Amino acid sequence: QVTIKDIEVLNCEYGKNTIKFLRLHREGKKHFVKEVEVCTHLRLTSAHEYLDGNNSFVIPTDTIKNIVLVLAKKNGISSIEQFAIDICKHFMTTFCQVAYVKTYIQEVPWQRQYQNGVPHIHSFILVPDGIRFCEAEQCRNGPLVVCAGIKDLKLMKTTQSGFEGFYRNEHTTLPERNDRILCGEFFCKWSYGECRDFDFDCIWSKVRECILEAFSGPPDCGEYSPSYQRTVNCIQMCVLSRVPQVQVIEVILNNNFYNVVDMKALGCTNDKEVLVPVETPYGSCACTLGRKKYLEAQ
Amino acid sequence: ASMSQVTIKDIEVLNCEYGKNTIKFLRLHREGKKHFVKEVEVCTHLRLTSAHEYLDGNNSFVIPTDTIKNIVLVLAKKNGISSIEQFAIDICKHFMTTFCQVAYVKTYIQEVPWQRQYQNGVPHIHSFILVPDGIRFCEAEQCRNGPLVVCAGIKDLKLMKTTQSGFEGFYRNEHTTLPERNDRILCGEFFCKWSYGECRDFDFDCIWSKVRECILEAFSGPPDCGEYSPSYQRTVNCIQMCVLSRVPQVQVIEVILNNNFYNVVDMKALGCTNDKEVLVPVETPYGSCACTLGRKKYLEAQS
Amino acid sequence: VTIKDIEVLNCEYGKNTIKFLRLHREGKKHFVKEVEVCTHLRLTSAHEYLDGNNSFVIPTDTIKNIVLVLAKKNGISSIEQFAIDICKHFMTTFCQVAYVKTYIQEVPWQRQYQNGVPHIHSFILVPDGIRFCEAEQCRNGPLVVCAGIKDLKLMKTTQSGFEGFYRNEHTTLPERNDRILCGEFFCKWSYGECRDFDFDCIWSKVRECILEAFSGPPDCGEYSPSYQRTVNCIQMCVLSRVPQVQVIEVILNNNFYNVVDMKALGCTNDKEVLVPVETPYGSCACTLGRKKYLEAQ
Amino acid sequence: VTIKDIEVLNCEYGKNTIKFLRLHREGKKHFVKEVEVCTHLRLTSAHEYLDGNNSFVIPTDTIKNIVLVLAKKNGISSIEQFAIDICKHFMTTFCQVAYVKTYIQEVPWQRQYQNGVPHIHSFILVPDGIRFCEAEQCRNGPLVVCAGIKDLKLMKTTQSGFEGFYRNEHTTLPERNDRILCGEFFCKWSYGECRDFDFDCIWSKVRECILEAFSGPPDCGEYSPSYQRTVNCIQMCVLSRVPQVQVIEVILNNNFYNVVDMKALGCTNDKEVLVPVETPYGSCACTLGRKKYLEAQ
Ligand SMILES: O=c1[nH]c(=O)c2nn[nH]c2[nH]1
Ligand SMILES: O=c1[nH]c(=O)c2nn[nH]c2[nH]1
Ligand SMILES: O=c1[nH]c(=O)c2nn[nH]c2[nH]1
Ligand SMILES: O=c1[nH]c(=O)c2nn[nH]c2[nH]1
Ligand SMILES: [Cl-]
Ligand SMILES: [Cl-]
Ligand SMILES: [Cl-]
Ligand SMILES: [Cl-]
Ligand SMILES: [Cl-]
Ligand SMILES: [Cl-]
Ligand SMILES: [Cl-]
Ligand SMILES: [Cl-]
Ligand SMILES: [Cl-]
Ligand SMILES: [Cl-]
Description:
The complex is a heterotetramer, with three copies of chain A and one copy of chain C (297 residues). Chain A is α+β, with helices and mostly antiparallel strands. Helices cover 24% and strands 41% of the residues of chain A. Chain A has two domains: 1-142, Urate Oxidase (Roll); 151-298, Urate Oxidase, CATH 3.10.270. Chain A has helices spanning 48-51, 61-75, 80-94, 200-216, 228-242, 292-296; strands at residues 7-27, 30-44, 98-107, 110-115, 118-126, 131-139, 144-157, 182-191, 248-260, 274-278, 282-291. In chain A, strands 1, 2, 3, 6, 7, 8, 9, 10 and 11 form a nine-stranded antiparallel sheet that branches. In chain A, strands 4-5 form a two-stranded antiparallel sheet. In chain A, helix 2 packs across helix 3 (80-94) and helix 4 packs antiparallel against helix 5. The longest helix of chain A is centred in the C-terminal third of the chain and has 17 residues, at 200-216. In chain C, 24% of the residues lie in helices and 41% in strands. Chains in contact: A-B, A-C, A-D, B-C, B-D, C-D.
């Protein structure tokens, strides 16, 4: 005889997803664009809309959309991180029924066109070299926490990669390799915690450079990777060493193996000339590192 | 910093996880001329008892993701697949009993929805058609020395009712332009996931089917009149309470409803009168709501 | 380089992915037809391209408005009749239209049932092959109607092989008399100008022919010596059983299911565990027409 | 219904999505060309379909093997030359082949740079337009080569309108002399049989013409009176500046950006916040050819 008495609400969450818009800014003839996709989710201090059919405290998801568009118009978007902070602060300062707010934003990667070294006043091209995103979240009476990241970042090096000295058992057929293609799709996300004493765009760029440089090694010789997992650690340690603002960094590496096609039966000798990617199944590894000092201090 | 560099000393590993994703295969079973298929997609992830592969470049304890794939295929061949839940349990148990360096294993499985073809009510011995009316999945996970926990679910389940839906009496402020509505199309894409915890005294396929029926029936109401929904959130609660009322084996149920609004096109400027005849779906932006309900007795009984 | 040096070989424009649901009520009982419509025009002039002169251009926005107005005024008895109505509207209304093509696909909503009782107003999405149609007309030429089914995925676990094929120095494929036959089908058939029949009944009849020819009889099935032969069996079955079909195109995109070699893993895979190859993939395509219909042009 | 009553209008088969990377080393410096290849054949007979006789069928598996062997033996100087090599191989090797078509697209790997210094062996995926080419040949006919760029998304925030279009009772679109012009481009051009040039240099030249004609000069831009006129400006720019292009097809799929009405929200939106409409969407397409090239057939 199952009633509300027997049942606990563990979690209730709602929001508006994929709010797409472009913020246009004009300085005379020169146009500036920031196109974004925004998700904003709320947890309310009550669940009457679920438990009783009573919508009294529910802010319509339509109103969440309107608030995002109004703030874009009124505040502009200097950085997606500042815009995410503004949205979270709006919900927390305005609505007592909001226990928690989270805003996710990703940039549409528009770049200004150039003709013969001259930047175009109002013409752009889509150049996805890794999607910039950020995330702000706040519990009522808790810290406002900001994360930034880069996803759908596909990096490949054609050498200075192996995987040797791994655990062997009766189901292990993988050969030892000291030369292979290292191809990874990266999801990288880092927390600034509460710190905001810096330029969000400059620090995002600095973290991106650390990820590319740690992945590749120096351009004249590169650097040997003994595993996907070690490359993830090199990226994380490089970011933490060079960017003090990063408190916690998560890196997910989804890899594609490139197989040297055996062409003996086709009367041919394939000396790492023709390689076929395996898209599925695929390996993943994931690590989150945090500074001892930041975790201790809570 | 006051250091030119962080070292292992300054850093904590909060999480390390690796695995094999999208292991696709079909398990074929023959009873004379009659063929039976189970095609699945499997993901298996491990956490090891150390992170030396990350911290030191030492792969001694790393089970190749290739070996994870080989083990999944061997177990499919040796054990068969009576249910994806039993197969996920078998995979988790294999990793825990075989590899001392495994601290944690998680197996996710989804079924390719093959249905046997029929001609004039007669089942075909060996011919199938793909019919995605909601993707069946399950998830098993175990910490070393902890419970083996099994969840089942259905995702990409798209349900629509053309009436008996409104949203009224919501909070109003200066940015609220949404009108009150007591008649609209309720169109939802559902993700539903439920925990059996450690309980296994039942047929996984029969109970999965029972939960699916509860979801469709609670969404729709009775076939002769339906049932009024005063919000997406209330419909989620009706689905959850229906499952919890009718299926004692479900301890915890999560439901996510991603909705599409269908707008009655204003056709006045085109010289005609649209009386809820032509409606245009809004795919983005879209609303979502999510609720997880659990039995007090099951949650209490854990620590 | 000027207008003088250049020929316009082709000019075409239109509105894509017009999505809407047409709701019809018979008391408490609701009926839905949700569709995605594309409508394309060729104009008798290209001044909008060649001179920057939009005088004859029907805005793509107007194409959308016309599709929605016709849905409201006429209803949708069948997507084929709706595609005919759209093509006729553009041809009879706009002298600047040289050519119109309307593509329509159905969102595959099915009415929910509880204990064998149909629900008055509740539906579930069941994509077991997308129904579509295409109507096209050149100015004062025939209005031609095609219907079809795409994203139709059929699989049989035996009664399939591929043997006796051409061998050369780059041919490693073994002969096989037992394999899984798994195909994603695109099927499209022309009624030409004929309209003396129920579009929904004939569509259903063609779908049944495709499933039955693919599968063979349910007690024993039927051996397929190639993907290409299975395509021919489907086409000949449709042409035999559905006189209204004049021309039928079938595309079969196949997935090979490989019996995993498990010798190195210390066991024996007797066609028990098979791994699908999604890419690269084989395709074959055939279009058959009735002599009578082709001759009579 | 038998073979007697039916004509085969078309038979075609092939291998789709052959993915591989061709690696080339000059000491420490690595060069990559990763491609996706489709190769389709029409055979001189249809016995595999009509009779269940596979004697002349080249397995699609052999098509894959041939593509990989040619990549290994010849390298890939350009995807156009590789597509030519594949077509020539099938025509010279197999007398049962009536027709061959090879489609190739590049995976857009770019070499990584650190402060202007190229990395010897490290790359990043940067899809700013997918490069493709297509070669086709009928037995005893010319080997024809086309090159192109697709999924090219360009946007300008002004110097775009659409005015003076045809009005009727279903036309609600207002006249506009200022709007965002946002287009996803598919561009494809024919060299015909001509091959007296560097395929990579000419591809780059055509890409620059497309960007420059779309944008106009960087200090003022150039007014577009329609999507259709912008397509014409791109085509005429390519034809003016690249003599090797004989025929050019351009498809523009547009997204309208709507200035959100914010009056009800107590706000004044002066082209500050714009929401893109992804569906439905307008398209226009034009193919232009040189008189000289078309006449000379
Ligand atoms: O670097 C690697 N890490 C792994 O865990 C793995 N498994 N197979 N190959 C691999 N390579
Ligand atoms: O049922 C509804 N719940 C919501 O939270 C909501 N927001 N806008 N419309 C809505 N409808
Ligand atoms: O039935 C088949 N037809 C083909 O053309 C083919 N090519 N490889 N395998 C094949 N199987
Ligand atoms: O430039 C344009 N061309 C068209 O054909 C059109 N239709 N609506 N808007 C349009 N804009
Ligand atoms: Cl540029
Ligand atoms: Cl290798
Ligand atoms: Cl530190
Ligand atoms: Cl069936
Ligand atoms: Cl049902
Ligand atoms: Cl068998
Ligand atoms: Cl086989
Ligand atoms: Cl006939
Ligand atoms: Cl770079
Ligand atoms: Cl505008």
